[PDB]
A and B are shown apart, each in its own frame.
Chain A
């Protein structure tokens, strides 16, 4: 029974919320520009773009 209550108290110590979001994998930031090339060019595919013009 003491093992029971002990496990209980374990749960009570551990049922507390995590202080924040916690680290995992944020490694290697994605390219901003290959994304833009996919977006634009694959959407610009087969188009007669005249650059930007004034």
Chain B
């Protein structure tokens, strides 16, 4: 198609869809990355949130 001084192959819907799925689940996993395991569990204290100053 004439993209004006460019012409392109038409992308699969599944390509961008997979891009969305992958990036979203990546946001989930990334939410599980540099965030998780900071609220350390205790039966008594419960989840804990250590700080130089709370």
Interface positions of A (Cβ within 8 A of B)? 3-4, 6-7
Contact = CB atoms under 8 A, between A and B. Distances in A.
Contacts of B43: 3-4, 6-7
Contacts of A4: 43
Prevailing SS type, chain B contact patch? loop
Contacts of B44: 7
6 contacts: A3-B41, A3-B43, A4-B43, A6-B43, A7-B43, A7-B44
Contacts of B41: 3
Interface in B3-54: 41, 43-44
A50 to B, nearest CB: 71
Nearest to A2: B43
B17 to A, nearest CB: 36
A24 B43 CA distance: 32
A20 to B, nearest CB: 29
A5 B44 CA distance: 11
3 smallest CB-CB distances across A and B, nearest first, come from A3-B43, A7-B43, A4-B43
